[PDB]
Design a protein around this nucleic acid. Structure first.
Ligand code: GTP
Ligand code: MG
Lengths: 610, 47, 36
RNA sequence: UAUCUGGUUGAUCCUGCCAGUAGUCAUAUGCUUGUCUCAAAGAUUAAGCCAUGCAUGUCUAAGUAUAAGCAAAUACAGU
RNA sequence: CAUCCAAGGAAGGCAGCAGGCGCGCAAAUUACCCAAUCCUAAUUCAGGGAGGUAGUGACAAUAAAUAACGAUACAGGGUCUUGUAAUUGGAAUGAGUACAAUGUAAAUACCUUAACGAGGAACAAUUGGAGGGCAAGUCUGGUGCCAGCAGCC
């Protein structure tokens, strides 16, 4: 065609360095492709969960945010509260119960934006670290730090140094360069206007990431609660029969199909099947939805809905294009067909205000109900309704002080479920068999088998100890991190066991041995095995004597000494326990302390024996 | 108070670093005893 | 007076917990030990 | 004053390449980051697109004062 | 390209200072002031995101803390010279905290200083590597395999 000499440039080195740096910038954009599965017409409100220590002032933060984005001060905040921002955005705020870890774990599983608040004068606390680890293990949402109580500092030098230290600790825990907000005072029950304005501005322009777990399993945030039973049914049969309960909220993630009887998991409650579902009209619509509606026929102050409270070129590019083109073919075949069968075959895509109703609901979900704890509903894949044993890998968490122990209770969260199991920790005998480990290694990973509901492979899980708020102390609560390797029913776990025995009559190259067995058939069953002495000479067993009850005769290569003690080495197969206990943390009269099985050291200290 | 305070292990965040001597903080003392062992060796061989 | 479904579920969970704790606090089985 | 050593050979020599050690107004990244002084910061890929706020106004004794403006020389007289 | 609405019409240009988007993988404050340097006007007086001040990822660069002197017992060179020690004795001091004063447009900070502040100096230094090259291991244990010897060491 032409010459490469003619199409040259004036500067080689600048091309070399700019091209290398541009290649690095271009490979910074590459990612692993997944699917969004988010609606384009009416996206659901983003969930903003505020998380921090008890007395640090999160209610004032959500109060100031709502006041700045609505010009309306609201008091007595409880439950999720929905606000509209801009022309398309809606944010549902939710306050975290600080003391409980259960709803805390559910919040970290559910939330899309997490406002994490830290006392500036005190410093970082254990609740912040625990929530950060739970969020990191279960799929990290967008974390935004805010620091309060900064008017308690009496010097500017200490204030600047503490701000730098908190910012760098946050940059260690979260990505580096993450910006966090500094809140000055509470002078009128709320924060200064400029900082609240910057908080509102940052979250009104931010975009979110498609997490792996949110894009296949449908989930639901419940905004209000109502019990639907006839009062005569309450009166006549003793007020205790399990009830029909209808609950309201917003669907996120995946269309939950419109056929009745789909299986449902409620975190902190259990597992049900939904009786009926329907799509109520949205009670807090975006304004743009209102001009769209008015355009179908061609909300000045109700921006708050709080019923809970009182008033090609690159492979990455072509795979993303493939995901987008199958998404738009699915959308365009959805658009050309009647809306009733759209509702029938897709089943309530996200952004829909959905009222669902179950049957057979216990009392303590209704009787001891409180508005200050979140309610989370979750759709279930079929693989998660089956039970079995799971073989995973886990480590002792690097901030947990003490190691774990085999056959001890562990309260672990996996998927949408949170339950207490009795795992057995095994190592491998160098890819030959499954060696049973009595303890947990201090700095390496061990496999673990435990009974529970099945799940997809490569699904993260996180275990903790007892969740009662009384005997917490200064210790850290996360105890096991890892992913699941495989699901099965039975695996071979092997424990080495050496039976002990003594000699009583010594011939030459032949001994008479007693004190391991008590019957002749026990010796006759184990004939042909090899017994080894303590000193180290080799031999085997030969015959069982008839008239003695347990004495038998065995062979040896050398003359056995009288004080030598024989042992027989066997490989006893042990089995897992089939205990499955859901935590039912939302089904308690206090919900701050739930005790199931206690640790071995705990019960040994309780009844005073070693 | 009931506020669960921070721990030293989880604040400074130095995990699995090898335990080094007190004299590795200051280079002057380490080079002092290095030169001192060197002159002891020199005094032992130049007798 | 009368028992609910939650009450019977919690009492059977509680007796399972009591049985498991009694099994755990007791001495281990000879097949679950070493150099026995 | 000017940092090279091997392989490519059983040795002797070109030629390119590879492995290693060291220096970097070189790009990117990681770990760590107590004090003093100092001073660089959206060019590298897009002179791509911009919410909101500010960035150019100005009166002397000395151009025009009936402000139903403010306080105290019947032509005005201060501000 | 793109904003507003009553649908008739009106309005737009951050390669100024902040700040945001441009990937779902990221990086300074939408801060204070004309006190300094100068610029503008009718003009000593007003204005100036020009500019200065402070804040912010170790750009780059300078100087520099994290210890110093002993007594006792062993190991020494062997009567005068050193090391080791869950041994011991008093001195000296700033990283921080802080009345004050200085500093500054007002501050922060620096320089100065009444007082507090050190034995595990816990007031808790890091990053790598070890036959070579151009330095520092003829150190230790464990793991996968062997139709090699013995046979479960
Ligand atoms: N000094 C100071 N006080 C604050 C600040 N923020 C909040 N407070 C005070 O801290 C108090 C406690 O916070 P709460 O209003 O009770 O909010 P909360 O974190 O949900 O605490 P609980 O309601 O008990 O769970 C408030 O009454 C505020 O007066 C702050 O930034 N500085
Ligand atoms: Mg509150």
């Amino acid at each position: 065609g032409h010459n490469a000499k003619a199409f040259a440039v004036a500067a080689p080195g600048k091309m070399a360095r700019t091209m290398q740096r541009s290649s690095d910038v271009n490979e910074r954009k590459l990612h692993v492709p997944m699917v969004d599965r988010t609606p384009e017409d009416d996206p659901p409100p983003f969930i903003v969960a505020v998380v921090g220590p008890p007395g640090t002032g999160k209610t004032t933060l959500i109060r100031s945010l709502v006041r700045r984005m609505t010009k309306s001060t609201l008091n007595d905040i409880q439950g999720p509260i929905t606000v509209v921002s801009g022309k398309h955005r809606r944010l549902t705020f939710l306050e975290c119960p600080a003391d409980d870890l259960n709803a805390m774990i559910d919040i970290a599983k559910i939330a899309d934006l997490v406002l994490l608040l830290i006392d500036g004068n005190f410093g970082f606390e254990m609740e912040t670290m625990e929530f950060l680890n739970i969020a990191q293990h279960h799929g990290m949402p967008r974390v935004l730090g805010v620091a309060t109580h900064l008017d308690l500092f009496k010097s500017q030098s200490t204030l600047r140094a503490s701000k730098k230290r908190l910012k760098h600790r946050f940059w260690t825990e979260v990505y580096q360069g993450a910006k966090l907000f500094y809140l000055s005072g509470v002078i009128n029950g709320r924060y200064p206007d400029r900082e609240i304005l910057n908080l509102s501005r940052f979250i009104s322009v931010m975009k979110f990431r498609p997490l792996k777990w949110r894009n296949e399993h449908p989930y639901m945030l419940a905004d209000r609660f109502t019990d639907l039973t006839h009062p005569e049914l309450i009166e006549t049969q003793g007020l205790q029969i399990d009830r029909k309960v209808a609950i309201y909220g917003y669907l996120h993630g995946t269309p939950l199909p419109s056929a009745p009887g789909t299986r449902v998991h409620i975190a902190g409650v259990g597992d049900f099947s939904v009786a009926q579902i329907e799509k109520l009209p949205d009670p807090c619509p975006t304004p743009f939805y209102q001009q769209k509606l008015d355009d179908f026929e061609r909300d000045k102050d109700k921006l708050i809905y709080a019923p809970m409270s009182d008033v090609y070129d690159t492979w990455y590019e072509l795979q993303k294009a493939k995901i987008s083109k199958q998404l738009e073919i699915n959308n365009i075949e959805y658009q050309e067909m009647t809306p009733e069968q759209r509702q029938r075959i897709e089943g309530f895509k996200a952004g829909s205000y959905v009222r669902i109703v179950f049957e057979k609901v216990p009392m303590e979900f209704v009787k001891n109900f409180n508005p200050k704890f979140p309610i989370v509903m979750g759709g279930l894949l079929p693989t998660e309704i089956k039970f079995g044993i799971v073989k995973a890998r886990l480590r002792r968490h690097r901030w947990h002080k003490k190691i774990l122990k085999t056959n001890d209770p562990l309260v672990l969260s996996l998927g949408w479920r949170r339950f207490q199991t009795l795992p057995i920790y095994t190592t491998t005998d160098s890819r030959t068999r499954t060696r049973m480990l009595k303890y947990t290694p201090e700095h390496t990973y061990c496999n673990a088998a435990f009974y529970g509901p099945l799940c997809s492979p490569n699904t993260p899980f996180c275990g903790v100890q007892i969740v009662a708020n009384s005997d917490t102390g200064n210790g850290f609560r996360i105890a096991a991190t890892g992913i699941v390797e495989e699901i099965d029913v039975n695996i071979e776990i092997v424990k080495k066991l050496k039976l002990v025995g003594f000699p009583y009559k010594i011939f030459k190259n032949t001994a008479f041995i007693k004190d391991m067995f008590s019957s002749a058939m026990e010796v006759a069953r184990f004939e042909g095995a090899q017994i080894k002495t303590v000193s180290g000479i080799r031999g085997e067993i030969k015959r069982a004597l008839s008239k003695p009850e347990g004495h038998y005769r065995a062979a040896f290569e050398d003359k056995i000494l009288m004080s030598d003690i024989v042992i027989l080495r066997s490989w006893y197969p042990v089995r897992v326990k089939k205990f499955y206990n859901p935590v039912t943390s939302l089904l308690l009269k206090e919900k701050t302390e739930w005790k199931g099985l206690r640790l071995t050291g705990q019960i040994r200290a309780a009844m005073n024996l070693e | 108070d009931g506020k669960r305070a921070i721990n030293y292990q989880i604040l400074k965040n130095k995990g699995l670093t090898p335990k080094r001597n007190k004299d590795n903080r200051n280079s002057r003392v380490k080079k002092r005893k290095k030169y001192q062992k060197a002159q002891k060796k020199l005094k032992s061989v130049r007798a | 007076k009368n028992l609910s479904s939650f009450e019977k579920q919690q009492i059977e969970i509680r007796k399972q917990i009591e049985q498991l704790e009694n099994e755990a606090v007791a001495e281990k089985k000879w097949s679950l030990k070493g150099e026995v």
